[PDB]
Design a protein around this nucleic acid. Structure first.
Length: 95
RNA sequence: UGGCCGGCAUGGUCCCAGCCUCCUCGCUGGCGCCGGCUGGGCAACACCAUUGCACUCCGGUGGUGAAUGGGAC
């Protein structure tokens, strides 16, 4: 069951050998051109590694990002993007 | 030596170069042989496992079972 459009894109299949600080940096390097980014959440725990939550200010940015960067080779692996199942807190504290 | 001990071997103090290491990365650490017991930590590194939807930091295991020569007194 696919997911509905969201402010936050959920990326997975990421290179797990990349430190947290660097991944957020590089992800911002390539995703900032799609619109303002409120935050990029990354955890290297057993359950959350290889995944990231990019939080865009406007849904159109997330959408563009999702369509434009699907399968993009990043740290030698094709990035798999989806919309986040639910809003991130940063988005709730507003809209 | 991360903490502790048993055996053996070994003239000393320095000075230069090379090398080693999970646990005070270097010049007021170390770089003989052999044996047993043991603490901490996944922080770095490595290996294993993991394709996982969060907004609570949080899988596991490994290492020192290491590293040479030269010079001056």
């Amino acid at each position: 069951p696919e997911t509905r459009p969201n402010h936050t894109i959920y990326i997975n299949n990421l290179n797990e050998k990349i430190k947290k600080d660097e991944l957020k940096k590089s992800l911002h390097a390539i995703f900032s051109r799609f619109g303002q980014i409120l935050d990029i959440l990354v955890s290297r725990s057993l359950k959350m590694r290889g995944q990231a939550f990019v939080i865009f200010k406007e849904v159109s940015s997330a959408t563009n990002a999702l369509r434009s960067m699907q399968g993009f080779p990043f740290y030698d692996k094709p990035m798999r993007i989806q919309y986040a199942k639910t809003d991130s807190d940063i988005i709730a504290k507003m809209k």
